[PDB]
Amino acid sequence: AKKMIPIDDDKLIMEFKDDATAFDGTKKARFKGKGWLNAQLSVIFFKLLEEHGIKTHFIGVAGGNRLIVEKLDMYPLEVVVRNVVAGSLKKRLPLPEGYELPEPIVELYYKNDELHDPMINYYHAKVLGISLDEIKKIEEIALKVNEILKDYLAKKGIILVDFKLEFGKDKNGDIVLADEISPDTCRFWDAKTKRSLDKDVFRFDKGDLIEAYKEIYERITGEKP
Amino acid sequence: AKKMIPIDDDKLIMEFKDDATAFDGTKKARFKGKGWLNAQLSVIFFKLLEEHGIKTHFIGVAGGNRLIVEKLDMYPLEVVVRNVVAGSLKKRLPLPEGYELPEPIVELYYKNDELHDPMINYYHAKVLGISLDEIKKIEEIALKVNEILKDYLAKKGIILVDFKLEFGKDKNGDIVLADEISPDTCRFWDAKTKRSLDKDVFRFDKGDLIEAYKEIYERITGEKP
Ligand SMILES: Nc1ncnc2c1ncn2[C@@H]1O[C@H](COP(=O)(O)OP(=O)(O)O)[C@@H](O)[C@H]1O
Ligand SMILES: Nc1ncnc2c1ncn2[C@@H]1O[C@H](COP(=O)(O)OP(=O)(O)O)[C@@H](O)[C@H]1O
Ligand SMILES: Cc1cn([C@H]2C[C@H](O)[C@@H](COP(=O)(O)O)O2)c(=O)[nH]c1=O
Ligand SMILES: Cc1cn([C@H]2C[C@H](O)[C@@H](COP(=O)(O)O)O2)c(=O)[nH]c1=O
Ligand SMILES: N[C@@H](CC(=O)O)C(=O)O
Ligand SMILES: N[C@@H](CC(=O)O)C(=O)O
Numbered sequence: 001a002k003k004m005i006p007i008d009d010d011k012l013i014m015e016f017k018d019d020a021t022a023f024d025g026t027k028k029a030r031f032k033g034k035g036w037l038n039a040q041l042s043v044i045f046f047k048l049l050e051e052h053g054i055k056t057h058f059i060g061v062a063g064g065n066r067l068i069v070e071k072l073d074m075y076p077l078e079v080v081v082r083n084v085v086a087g088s089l090k091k092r093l094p095l096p097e098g099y100e101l102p103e104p105i106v107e108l109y110y111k112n113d114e115l116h117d118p119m120i121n122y123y124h125a126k127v128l129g130i131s132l133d134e135i136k137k138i139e140e141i142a143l144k145v146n147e148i149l150k151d152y153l154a155k156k157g158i159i160l161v162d163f164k165l166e167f168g169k170d171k172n173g174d175i176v177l178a179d180e181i182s183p184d185t186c187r188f189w190d191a192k193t194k195r196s197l198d199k200d201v202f203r204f205d206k207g208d209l210i211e212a213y214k215e216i217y218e219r220i221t222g223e224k225p
Numbered sequence: 226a227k228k229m230i231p232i233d234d235d236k237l238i239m240e241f242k243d244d245a246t247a248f249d250g251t252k253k254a255r256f257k258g259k260g261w262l263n264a265q266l267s268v269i270f271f272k273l274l275e276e277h278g279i280k281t282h283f284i285g286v287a288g289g290n291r292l293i294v295e296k297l298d299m300y301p302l303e304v305v306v307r308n309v310v311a312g313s314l315k316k317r318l319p320l321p322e323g324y325e326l327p328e329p330i331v332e333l334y335y336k337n338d339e340l341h342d343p344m345i346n347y348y349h350a351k352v353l354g355i356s357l358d359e360i361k362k363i364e365e366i367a368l369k370v371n372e373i374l375k376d377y378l379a380k381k382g383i384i385l386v387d388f389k390l391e392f393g394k395d396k397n398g399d400i401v402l403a404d405e406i407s408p409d410t411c412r413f414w415d416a417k418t419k420r421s422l423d424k425d426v427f428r429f430d431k432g433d434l435i436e437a438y439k440e441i442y443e444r445i446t447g448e449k450p
Contacts, residue, residue: 092335092344093335094337094339094340095352101352103348108346112319118317119344120317121332121333123328124318124330126327127326
Protein backbone atom coordinates (compact mmCIF):
# COMPACT_ATOMS: atom_id res chain seq x y z
CA ALA A 1 0.00 0.00 0.00
CA LYS A 2 3.05 2.38 0.24
CA LYS A 3 6.41 3.03 -1.54
CA MET A 4 9.43 4.71 0.14
CA ILE A 5 11.80 6.73 -2.11
CA PRO A 6 15.07 8.14 -0.66
CA ILE A 7 15.98 11.78 -1.37
CA ASP A 8 19.19 12.66 0.49
CA ASP A 9 20.44 11.73 3.99
CA ASP A 10 17.72 13.62 5.85
CA LYS A 11 14.48 12.78 4.09
CA LEU A 12 12.53 10.39 1.93
CA ILE A 13 9.33 10.25 -0.10
CA MET A 14 6.40 8.28 1.26
CA GLU A 15 4.07 7.36 -1.59
CA PHE A 16 0.62 5.87 -0.98
CA LYS A 17 -0.57 3.26 -3.50
CA ASP A 18 -4.08 2.16 -4.49
CA ASP A 19 -3.24 -1.41 -3.37
CA ALA A 20 -5.02 -3.08 -0.45
CA THR A 21 -4.11 -6.35 1.31
CA ALA A 22 -5.52 -8.25 4.28
CA PHE A 23 -5.07 -11.46 6.24
CA ASP A 24 -1.27 -11.45 6.09
CA GLY A 25 -1.36 -10.27 2.45
CA THR A 26 -3.48 -13.24 1.29
CA LYS A 27 -6.44 -11.09 0.15
CA LYS A 28 -5.67 -8.43 -2.51
CA ALA A 29 -7.53 -5.74 -4.45
CA ARG A 30 -6.90 -2.32 -5.94
CA PHE A 31 -9.04 0.72 -5.22
CA LYS A 32 -8.66 3.77 -7.46
CA GLY A 33 -8.27 6.85 -5.30
CA LYS A 34 -7.29 5.00 -2.06
CA GLY A 35 -3.68 6.20 -2.25
CA TRP A 36 -4.92 9.80 -2.47
CA LEU A 37 -7.36 9.44 0.40
CA ASN A 38 -4.80 7.79 2.70
CA ALA A 39 -2.13 10.40 1.82
CA GLN A 40 -4.43 13.33 2.56
CA LEU A 41 -5.79 11.85 5.76
CA SER A 42 -2.29 11.10 7.06
CA VAL A 43 -1.38 14.76 6.41
CA ILE A 44 -4.43 15.98 8.35
CA PHE A 45 -3.72 13.67 11.30
CA PHE A 46 0.02 14.51 11.43
CA LYS A 47 -0.76 18.24 11.34
CA LEU A 48 -3.33 17.86 14.13
CA LEU A 49 -0.82 15.91 16.27
CA GLU A 50 2.02 18.37 15.56
CA GLU A 51 -0.16 21.27 16.80
CA HIS A 52 -0.63 19.26 19.97
CA GLY A 53 3.10 18.90 20.47
CA ILE A 54 3.56 15.36 19.05
CA LYS A 55 6.85 14.98 17.17
CA THR A 56 6.08 13.34 13.82
CA HIS A 57 8.10 12.61 10.68
CA PHE A 58 5.86 14.75 8.46
CA ILE A 59 7.83 17.46 6.58
CA GLY A 60 5.56 18.27 3.64
CA VAL A 61 3.60 17.21 0.59
CA ALA A 62 5.12 16.25 -2.78
CA GLY A 63 1.97 16.39 -4.93
CA GLY A 64 -0.83 13.83 -5.16
CA ASN A 65 -0.14 10.65 -3.21
CA ARG A 66 3.39 11.51 -1.99
CA LEU A 67 4.52 12.99 1.34
CA ILE A 68 7.94 14.32 2.30
CA VAL A 69 9.02 12.80 5.60
CA GLU A 70 12.00 12.73 7.93
CA LYS A 71 14.21 9.65 7.59
CA LEU A 72 14.36 7.79 10.91
CA ASP A 73 15.99 4.78 12.47
CA MET A 74 12.77 2.74 12.77
CA TYR A 75 11.82 0.66 15.77
CA PRO A 76 10.72 -2.78 14.59
CA LEU A 77 7.28 -2.30 16.26
CA GLU A 78 3.63 -1.87 15.54
CA VAL A 79 2.09 -0.11 18.54
CA VAL A 80 -1.63 -0.68 18.79
CA VAL A 81 -3.94 1.44 20.95
CA ARG A 82 -7.45 0.09 21.64
CA ASN A 83 -10.55 1.82 23.10
CA VAL A 84 -13.36 -0.48 21.97
CA VAL A 85 -13.15 -4.30 21.60
CA ALA A 86 -12.71 -5.35 17.96
CA GLY A 87 -10.51 -7.51 15.72
CA SER A 88 -7.81 -9.64 17.34
CA LEU A 89 -8.65 -8.36 20.85
CA LYS A 90 -11.67 -10.72 20.88
CA LYS A 91 -9.12 -13.60 21.00
CA ARG A 92 -7.39 -12.22 24.12
CA LEU A 93 -10.33 -11.07 26.24
CA PRO A 94 -13.71 -12.83 26.62
CA LEU A 95 -15.51 -9.65 25.62
CA PRO A 96 -17.88 -8.89 22.74
CA GLU A 97 -17.21 -6.75 19.68
CA GLY A 98 -18.15 -3.18 20.67
CA TYR A 99 -17.41 -3.53 24.38
CA GLU A 100 -16.19 -0.18 25.71
CA LEU A 101 -12.86 -0.64 27.53
CA PRO A 102 -12.57 0.94 31.03
CA GLU A 103 -9.26 2.42 29.85
CA PRO A 104 -7.14 2.15 26.70
CA ILE A 105 -5.10 -1.00 25.98
CA VAL A 106 -1.63 -0.67 24.38
CA GLU A 107 -0.28 -3.72 22.54
CA LEU A 108 3.22 -4.17 21.10
CA TYR A 109 3.82 -6.23 17.96
CA TYR A 110 7.24 -7.16 16.63
CA LYS A 111 7.49 -6.22 12.92
CA ASN A 112 8.86 -9.45 11.48
CA ASP A 113 7.79 -11.32 8.32
CA GLU A 114 9.38 -14.65 9.21
CA LEU A 115 7.24 -14.58 12.40
CA HIS A 116 4.10 -12.80 11.08
CA ASP A 117 4.25 -9.84 13.45
CA PRO A 118 3.84 -11.62 16.81
CA MET A 119 2.67 -9.80 19.93
CA ILE A 120 5.48 -9.08 22.37
CA ASN A 121 5.95 -7.47 25.77
CA TYR A 122 8.64 -5.16 27.30
CA TYR A 123 10.95 -8.09 28.02
CA HIS A 124 11.00 -9.36 24.44
CA ALA A 125 11.49 -5.74 23.38
CA LYS A 126 14.57 -5.41 25.62
CA VAL A 127 16.05 -8.55 23.96
CA LEU A 128 15.40 -6.84 20.60
CA GLY A 129 17.51 -3.87 21.82
CA ILE A 130 14.71 -1.56 22.98
CA SER A 131 15.17 -0.28 26.52
CA LEU A 132 12.40 -0.01 29.08
CA ASP A 133 12.79 3.80 29.04
CA GLU A 134 12.21 3.80 25.28
CA ILE A 135 9.13 1.51 25.47
CA LYS A 136 7.71 3.77 28.20
CA LYS A 137 8.23 6.96 26.09
CA ILE A 138 6.65 5.16 23.08
CA GLU A 139 3.53 4.11 25.05
CA GLU A 140 3.26 7.61 26.59
CA ILE A 141 3.22 9.18 23.11
CA ALA A 142 0.76 6.55 21.74
CA LEU A 143 -1.67 7.21 24.61
CA LYS A 144 -1.42 10.97 24.05
CA VAL A 145 -2.04 10.41 20.31
CA ASN A 146 -5.08 8.29 21.30
CA GLU A 147 -6.53 11.13 23.42
CA ILE A 148 -6.12 13.76 20.70
CA LEU A 149 -7.42 11.61 17.84
CA LYS A 150 -10.36 10.20 19.82
CA ASP A 151 -11.52 13.66 21.07
CA TYR A 152 -11.11 15.20 17.64
CA LEU A 153 -13.01 12.37 15.94
CA ALA A 154 -15.74 12.12 18.63
CA LYS A 155 -16.72 15.72 17.87
CA LYS A 156 -17.28 14.59 14.27
CA GLY A 157 -19.45 11.62 15.23
CA ILE A 158 -16.67 9.06 14.77
CA ILE A 159 -15.62 6.53 17.39
CA LEU A 160 -11.90 5.76 17.34
CA VAL A 161 -12.11 2.02 18.03
CA ASP A 162 -8.38 1.12 17.79
CA PHE A 163 -5.34 2.01 15.63
CA LYS A 164 -1.75 1.15 14.80
CA LEU A 165 1.29 3.44 15.08
CA GLU A 166 4.96 3.11 14.23
CA PHE A 167 7.97 5.01 15.54
CA GLY A 168 11.58 5.79 14.80
CA LYS A 169 14.51 7.58 16.38
CA ASP A 170 15.85 10.85 14.90
CA LYS A 171 19.49 12.00 14.89
CA ASN A 172 19.04 13.60 18.35
CA GLY A 173 17.84 10.25 19.66
CA ASP A 174 14.27 11.59 20.06
CA ILE A 175 11.31 9.27 19.51
CA VAL A 176 9.32 10.38 16.46
CA LEU A 177 5.93 9.18 15.18
CA ALA A 178 6.32 7.68 11.71
CA ASP A 179 4.61 5.64 8.94
CA GLU A 180 0.94 6.54 8.32
CA ILE A 181 -2.36 7.24 10.04
CA SER A 182 -5.26 6.42 7.73
CA PRO A 183 -8.42 4.26 7.52
CA ASP A 184 -5.95 1.44 6.60
CA THR A 185 -4.36 1.64 10.06
CA CYS A 186 -7.33 2.65 12.28
CA ARG A 187 -10.83 1.46 13.07
CA PHE A 188 -13.42 4.24 12.64
CA TRP A 189 -17.09 3.60 13.56
CA ASP A 190 -20.03 5.90 13.00
CA ALA A 191 -21.11 6.97 16.52
CA LYS A 192 -24.77 6.26 15.71
CA THR A 193 -24.91 3.17 13.51
CA LYS A 194 -21.65 1.67 14.86
CA ARG A 195 -20.73 0.90 11.21
CA SER A 196 -17.17 0.71 9.87
CA LEU A 197 -15.65 3.59 7.93
CA ASP A 198 -12.26 1.90 7.47
CA LYS A 199 -10.32 -1.06 6.02
CA ASP A 200 -12.73 -3.52 7.75
CA VAL A 201 -15.15 -2.72 4.88
CA PHE A 202 -12.59 -4.44 2.59
CA ARG A 203 -11.47 -7.03 5.15
CA PHE A 204 -15.01 -8.41 5.68
CA ASP A 205 -16.90 -7.23 2.56
CA LYS A 206 -18.98 -4.73 4.56
CA GLY A 207 -19.50 -2.52 1.49
CA ASP A 208 -17.53 -0.27 -0.84
CA LEU A 209 -14.14 0.75 0.56
CA ILE A 210 -13.82 3.97 -1.47
CA GLU A 211 -17.30 5.20 -0.36
CA ALA A 212 -16.37 4.53 3.28
CA TYR A 213 -13.00 6.35 2.92
CA LYS A 214 -14.68 9.29 1.10
CA GLU A 215 -17.21 9.55 3.93
CA ILE A 216 -14.42 9.72 6.54
CA TYR A 217 -12.64 12.35 4.47
CA GLU A 218 -15.84 14.41 4.11
CA ARG A 219 -16.81 14.12 7.78
CA ILE A 220 -13.34 15.28 8.82
CA THR A 221 -12.71 18.03 6.25
CA GLY A 222 -16.26 19.26 5.57
CA GLU A 223 -15.29 19.14 1.87
CA LYS A 224 -15.93 16.59 -0.93
CA PRO A 225 -12.83 14.67 -2.19
CA ALA B 226 -2.58 -34.08 36.03
CA LYS B 227 -3.91 -32.76 39.42
CA LYS B 228 -7.07 -32.98 41.62
CA MET B 229 -8.08 -30.32 44.20
CA ILE B 230 -10.05 -31.49 47.28
CA PRO B 231 -11.47 -28.90 49.74
CA ILE B 232 -10.94 -29.44 53.49
CA ASP B 233 -12.37 -26.47 55.40
CA ASP B 234 -12.30 -22.71 54.67
CA ASP B 235 -8.53 -22.34 55.01
CA LYS B 236 -7.03 -25.25 53.11
CA LEU B 237 -7.38 -27.83 50.40
CA ILE B 238 -5.73 -31.02 49.18
CA MET B 239 -3.65 -30.88 46.02
CA GLU B 240 -3.37 -34.37 44.55
CA PHE B 241 -0.98 -35.17 41.69
CA LYS B 242 -2.20 -37.75 39.15
CA ASP B 243 -0.26 -40.04 36.80
CA ASP B 244 -1.99 -38.39 33.80
CA ALA B 245 -0.06 -36.39 31.21
CA THR B 246 -1.45 -34.15 28.44
CA ALA B 247 0.12 -31.93 25.79
CA PHE B 248 -0.80 -29.71 22.86
CA ASP B 249 -3.90 -28.23 24.47
CA GLY B 250 -4.84 -31.64 25.92
CA THR B 251 -4.91 -33.34 22.50
CA LYS B 252 -2.09 -35.81 23.34
CA LYS B 253 -2.69 -38.09 26.36
CA ALA B 254 -0.85 -40.84 28.23
CA ARG B 255 -0.52 -42.19 31.76
CA PHE B 256 2.80 -42.70 33.52
CA LYS B 257 2.86 -44.80 36.69
CA GLY B 258 4.76 -42.94 39.38
CA LYS B 259 4.54 -39.46 37.73
CA GLY B 260 2.07 -38.17 40.35
CA TRP B 261 4.51 -39.20 43.09
CA LEU B 262 7.52 -37.62 41.41
CA ASN B 263 5.72 -34.33 40.72
CA ALA B 264 4.33 -34.18 44.29
CA GLN B 265 7.73 -34.73 45.89
CA LEU B 266 9.53 -32.32 43.61
CA SER B 267 6.94 -29.59 44.24
CA VAL B 268 7.51 -30.08 47.99
CA ILE B 269 11.28 -29.74 47.59
CA PHE B 270 10.96 -26.59 45.46
CA PHE B 271 8.38 -24.94 47.76
CA LYS B 272 10.55 -25.66 50.81
CA LEU B 273 13.62 -24.21 49.06
CA LEU B 274 11.67 -21.06 48.10
CA GLU B 275 10.15 -20.67 51.59
CA GLU B 276 13.65 -20.72 53.14
CA HIS B 277 14.49 -17.91 50.76
CA GLY B 278 11.55 -15.84 51.94
CA ILE B 279 9.08 -16.63 49.11
CA LYS B 280 5.50 -16.89 50.37
CA THR B 281 4.02 -20.11 48.96
CA HIS B 282 0.76 -22.02 49.51
CA PHE B 283 2.55 -25.14 50.77
CA ILE B 284 1.34 -26.21 54.25
CA GLY B 285 2.28 -29.90 54.38
CA VAL B 286 2.13 -33.40 52.97
CA ALA B 287 -0.91 -35.71 53.14
CA GLY B 288 0.77 -38.99 52.20
CA GLY B 289 1.83 -40.19 48.75
CA ASN B 290 0.74 -37.89 45.95
CA ARG B 291 -1.22 -35.35 48.05
CA LEU B 292 -0.10 -31.99 49.47
CA ILE B 293 -1.87 -29.77 51.98
CA VAL B 294 -2.00 -26.21 50.67
CA GLU B 295 -3.45 -22.84 51.58
CA LYS B 296 -6.69 -21.95 49.77
CA LEU B 297 -6.21 -18.75 47.76
CA ASP B 298 -8.16 -16.41 45.55
CA MET B 299 -6.32 -17.36 42.33
CA TYR B 300 -5.19 -14.88 39.70
CA PRO B 301 -6.26 -16.15 36.28
CA LEU B 302 -2.60 -16.15 35.09
CA GLU B 303 0.21 -18.39 34.03
CA VAL B 304 3.45 -16.48 34.62
CA VAL B 305 6.29 -17.80 32.52
CA VAL B 306 9.95 -17.01 33.21
CA ARG B 307 12.47 -17.78 30.44
CA ASN B 308 16.31 -17.92 30.54
CA VAL B 309 17.11 -19.96 27.42
CA VAL B 310 15.16 -19.90 24.11
CA ALA B 311 12.83 -22.90 23.78
CA GLY B 312 9.21 -23.81 23.03
CA SER B 313 6.81 -21.02 22.04
CA LEU B 314 9.50 -18.32 22.43
CA LYS B 315 10.93 -19.40 19.03
CA LYS B 316 7.70 -17.97 17.49
CA ARG B 317 8.21 -14.54 19.09
CA LEU B 318 11.95 -13.97 18.65
CA PRO B 319 14.07 -14.93 15.60
CA LEU B 320 16.45 -16.86 17.83
CA PRO B 321 17.47 -20.52 17.87
CA GLU B 322 16.56 -23.16 20.44
CA GLY B 323 19.26 -22.96 23.14
CA TYR B 324 20.06 -19.27 22.70
CA GLU B 325 21.07 -17.82 26.07
CA LEU B 326 18.97 -14.72 26.83
CA PRO B 327 20.87 -11.58 27.96
CA GLU B 328 18.36 -11.34 30.82
CA PRO B 329 15.22 -13.26 31.84
CA ILE B 330 11.94 -12.78 29.94
CA VAL B 331 8.63 -12.76 31.87
CA GLU B 332 5.48 -13.60 29.91
CA LEU B 333 1.87 -13.37 31.13
CA TYR B 334 -0.80 -15.78 29.90
CA TYR B 335 -4.49 -15.44 30.64
CA LYS B 336 -5.84 -18.75 32.04
CA ASN B 337 -8.92 -19.20 29.87
CA ASP B 338 -10.18 -22.36 28.11
CA GLU B 339 -12.50 -20.61 25.67
CA LEU B 340 -9.43 -18.66 24.47
CA HIS B 341 -6.70 -21.33 24.91
CA ASP B 342 -4.56 -19.37 27.36
CA PRO B 343 -3.59 -16.38 25.19
CA MET B 344 -0.57 -14.20 25.97
CA ILE B 345 -1.50 -10.87 27.51
CA ASN B 346 0.23 -7.73 28.76
CA TYR B 347 -0.30 -5.39 31.78
CA TYR B 348 -3.10 -3.52 30.02
CA HIS B 349 -5.19 -6.63 29.32
CA ALA B 350 -4.48 -7.66 32.91
CA LYS B 351 -5.87 -4.36 34.22
CA VAL B 352 -9.09 -4.97 32.21
CA LEU B 353 -9.24 -8.40 33.88
CA GLY B 354 -9.16 -6.65 37.29
CA ILE B 355 -5.44 -6.98 38.06
CA SER B 356 -3.78 -3.70 38.99
CA LEU B 357 -0.38 -2.60 37.78
CA ASP B 358 0.92 -2.77 41.38
CA GLU B 359 -0.19 -6.40 41.57
CA ILE B 360 1.39 -7.36 38.20
CA LYS B 361 4.63 -5.70 39.33
CA LYS B 362 4.69 -7.63 42.66
CA ILE B 363 3.93 -10.87 40.74
CA GLU B 364 6.82 -10.34 38.25
CA GLU B 365 9.17 -9.36 41.11
CA ILE B 366 8.42 -12.63 42.92
CA ALA B 367 8.69 -14.70 39.69
CA LEU B 368 12.12 -13.21 38.92
CA LYS B 369 13.30 -13.91 42.48
CA VAL B 370 11.99 -17.49 42.16
CA ASN B 371 13.94 -17.73 38.86
CA GLU B 372 17.20 -16.67 40.57
CA ILE B 373 16.85 -19.15 43.42
CA LEU B 374 15.78 -22.12 41.28
CA LYS B 375 18.37 -21.47 38.55
CA ASP B 376 21.29 -21.12 41.04
CA TYR B 377 20.19 -24.16 43.00
CA LEU B 378 19.80 -26.27 39.86
CA ALA B 379 23.00 -25.00 38.17
CA LYS B 380 25.00 -26.38 41.09
CA LYS B 381 23.47 -29.77 40.27
CA GLY B 382 24.34 -29.60 36.57
CA ILE B 383 20.83 -28.63 35.48
CA ILE B 384 20.00 -25.61 33.33
CA LEU B 385 16.66 -24.01 34.20
CA VAL B 386 15.53 -23.17 30.66
CA ASP B 387 12.05 -21.73 31.44
CA PHE B 388 9.10 -22.45 33.77
CA LYS B 389 5.50 -21.59 34.59
CA LEU B 390 4.16 -20.22 37.89
CA GLU B 391 0.71 -19.39 39.22
CA PHE B 392 -0.34 -17.08 42.04
CA GLY B 393 -3.21 -16.27 44.34
CA LYS B 394 -4.14 -13.74 46.99
CA ASP B 395 -4.44 -14.77 50.67
CA LYS B 396 -6.87 -13.32 53.23
CA ASN B 397 -4.38 -10.52 54.08
CA GLY B 398 -4.29 -9.58 50.40
CA ASP B 399 -0.70 -10.85 50.07
CA ILE B 400 0.46 -12.42 46.81
CA VAL B 401 1.25 -16.11 47.34
CA LEU B 402 2.93 -18.62 44.99
CA ALA B 403 0.52 -21.45 44.21
CA ASP B 404 -0.13 -24.51 41.99
CA GLU B 405 2.93 -26.71 41.33
CA ILE B 406 6.60 -26.62 40.38
CA SER B 407 7.61 -29.89 38.70
CA PRO B 408 9.13 -31.25 35.46
CA ASP B 409 5.57 -30.80 34.07
CA THR B 410 5.82 -27.02 34.50
CA CYS B 411 9.57 -26.36 33.91
CA ARG B 412 12.19 -27.05 31.28
CA PHE B 413 15.27 -28.76 32.75
CA TRP B 414 18.32 -29.46 30.53
CA ASP B 415 21.43 -31.40 31.44
CA ALA B 416 24.23 -28.77 31.54
CA LYS B 417 26.52 -31.01 29.47
CA THR B 418 24.40 -32.81 26.88
CA LYS B 419 21.70 -30.08 26.74
CA ARG B 420 19.12 -32.91 26.86
CA SER B 421 15.62 -32.58 28.34
CA LEU B 422 14.82 -33.91 31.79
CA ASP B 423 11.18 -32.74 31.74
CA LYS B 424 7.76 -32.99 30.05
CA ASP B 425 9.37 -32.26 26.63
CA VAL B 426 10.45 -35.94 26.67
CA PHE B 427 6.71 -36.77 26.47
CA ARG B 428 5.77 -33.77 24.30
CA PHE B 429 8.24 -34.70 21.51
CA ASP B 430 8.96 -38.42 22.16
CA LYS B 431 12.53 -37.70 23.30
CA GLY B 432 12.60 -40.86 25.43
CA ASP B 433 11.01 -42.30 28.56
CA LEU B 434 9.31 -39.67 30.73
CA ILE B 435 9.58 -41.62 34.01
CA GLU B 436 13.36 -42.21 33.53
CA ALA B 437 13.86 -38.48 32.88
CA TYR B 438 11.77 -37.51 35.97
CA LYS B 439 13.62 -40.11 38.13
CA GLU B 440 16.94 -38.65 36.98
CA ILE B 441 15.86 -35.13 37.99
CA TYR B 442 14.69 -36.45 41.35
CA GLU B 443 17.99 -38.29 41.90
CA ARG B 444 20.18 -35.38 40.81
CA ILE B 445 18.33 -33.05 43.19
CA THR B 446 17.92 -35.33 46.22
CA GLY B 447 21.01 -37.55 45.93
CA GLU B 448 18.63 -40.46 46.66
CA LYS B 449 16.89 -43.05 44.42
CA PRO B 450 13.05 -42.70 44.14
N1 LIG C 1 10.11 8.31 8.67
C1 LIG C 1 10.47 7.06 8.31
N2 LIG C 1 11.78 6.74 8.14
C2 LIG C 1 12.17 5.51 7.78
N3 LIG C 1 11.30 4.51 7.55
C3 LIG C 1 9.96 4.68 7.68
C4 LIG C 1 9.45 6.01 8.08
N4 LIG C 1 8.10 5.89 8.14
C5 LIG C 1 7.78 4.62 7.81
N5 LIG C 1 8.89 3.90 7.54
C6 LIG C 1 8.96 2.46 7.14
O1 LIG C 1 8.72 2.28 5.74
C7 LIG C 1 7.99 1.07 5.51
C8 LIG C 1 6.66 1.41 4.84
O2 LIG C 1 6.26 0.36 3.96
P1 LIG C 1 4.94 -0.53 4.19
O3 LIG C 1 5.42 -1.95 4.43
O4 LIG C 1 3.99 -0.26 3.05
O5 LIG C 1 4.30 0.11 5.53
P2 LIG C 1 4.09 -0.69 6.92
O6 LIG C 1 4.78 -2.02 6.72
O7 LIG C 1 4.77 0.17 7.95
O8 LIG C 1 2.59 -0.76 7.03
C9 LIG C 1 7.79 0.44 6.88
O9 LIG C 1 8.83 -0.53 7.10
C10 LIG C 1 7.94 1.60 7.85
O10 LIG C 1 8.43 1.20 9.13
N1 LIG D 1 -3.52 -22.63 46.72
C1 LIG D 1 -4.49 -22.70 45.79
N2 LIG D 1 -5.74 -22.26 46.07
C2 LIG D 1 -6.74 -22.32 45.17
N3 LIG D 1 -6.56 -22.82 43.93
C3 LIG D 1 -5.36 -23.29 43.51
C4 LIG D 1 -4.22 -23.25 44.44
N4 LIG D 1 -3.16 -23.76 43.77
C5 LIG D 1 -3.58 -24.10 42.52
N5 LIG D 1 -4.89 -23.81 42.37
C6 LIG D 1 -5.73 -24.02 41.16
O1 LIG D 1 -6.20 -25.37 41.05
C7 LIG D 1 -6.23 -25.80 39.68
C8 LIG D 1 -5.30 -26.99 39.52
O2 LIG D 1 -5.79 -27.88 38.51
P1 LIG D 1 -5.02 -28.16 37.12
O3 LIG D 1 -5.91 -27.62 36.02
O4 LIG D 1 -4.61 -29.61 37.11
O5 LIG D 1 -3.67 -27.28 37.27
P2 LIG D 1 -3.26 -26.05 36.30
O6 LIG D 1 -4.47 -25.83 35.42
O7 LIG D 1 -3.02 -24.90 37.24
O8 LIG D 1 -2.04 -26.59 35.60
C9 LIG D 1 -5.77 -24.60 38.87
O9 LIG D 1 -6.91 -23.88 38.41
C10 LIG D 1 -4.99 -23.76 39.86
O10 LIG D 1 -5.01 -22.36 39.56
C1 LIG E 1 -2.70 -6.56 11.80
C2 LIG E 1 -2.65 -5.08 11.52
C3 LIG E 1 -3.51 -4.20 12.19
N1 LIG E 1 -3.47 -2.87 11.93
C4 LIG E 1 -4.37 -1.96 12.64
C5 LIG E 1 -5.82 -2.16 12.22
C6 LIG E 1 -6.60 -2.07 13.50
O1 LIG E 1 -7.07 -0.73 13.54
C7 LIG E 1 -5.60 -2.23 14.65
C8 LIG E 1 -5.76 -3.54 15.42
O2 LIG E 1 -5.79 -4.64 14.51
P1 LIG E 1 -6.06 -6.15 14.99
O3 LIG E 1 -7.46 -6.10 15.56
O4 LIG E 1 -5.88 -6.91 13.73
O5 LIG E 1 -4.97 -6.45 16.01
O6 LIG E 1 -4.29 -2.15 14.06
C9 LIG E 1 -2.55 -2.36 10.97
O7 LIG E 1 -2.53 -1.13 10.74
N2 LIG E 1 -1.70 -3.16 10.30
C10 LIG E 1 -1.71 -4.49 10.52
O8 LIG E 1 -0.94 -5.25 9.89
C1 LIG F 1 1.71 -24.08 27.60
C2 LIG F 1 2.20 -24.43 28.99
C3 LIG F 1 3.53 -24.27 29.34
N1 LIG F 1 3.96 -24.59 30.59
C4 LIG F 1 5.37 -24.41 30.95
C5 LIG F 1 6.27 -25.39 30.21
C6 LIG F 1 7.47 -24.58 29.82
O1 LIG F 1 8.43 -24.85 30.82
C7 LIG F 1 7.08 -23.10 29.95
C8 LIG F 1 6.97 -22.37 28.62
O2 LIG F 1 6.15 -23.12 27.72
P1 LIG F 1 5.92 -22.67 26.19
O3 LIG F 1 7.30 -22.76 25.58
O4 LIG F 1 4.92 -23.68 25.73
O5 LIG F 1 5.34 -21.27 26.26
O6 LIG F 1 5.82 -23.08 30.64
C9 LIG F 1 3.04 -25.11 31.55
O7 LIG F 1 3.46 -25.40 32.69
N2 LIG F 1 1.74 -25.28 31.25
C10 LIG F 1 1.27 -24.98 30.03
O8 LIG F 1 0.07 -25.16 29.75
N1 LIG G 1 -5.93 -7.88 7.87
C1 LIG G 1 -4.59 -7.38 8.30
C2 LIG G 1 -3.48 -8.34 7.88
C3 LIG G 1 -3.29 -9.49 8.85
O1 LIG G 1 -4.27 -9.89 9.50
O2 LIG G 1 -2.15 -9.99 8.95
C4 LIG G 1 -4.28 -5.99 7.77
O3 LIG G 1 -4.60 -4.99 8.42
O4 LIG G 1 -3.69 -5.84 6.70
N1 LIG H 1 2.10 -28.89 25.52
C1 LIG H 1 1.42 -27.97 26.49
C2 LIG H 1 -0.06 -27.80 26.13
C3 LIG H 1 -0.30 -26.76 25.07
O1 LIG H 1 0.59 -26.56 24.22
O2 LIG H 1 -1.38 -26.14 25.08
C4 LIG H 1 1.55 -28.43 27.93
O3 LIG H 1 2.49 -28.07 28.62
O4 LIG H 1 0.69 -29.16 28.44
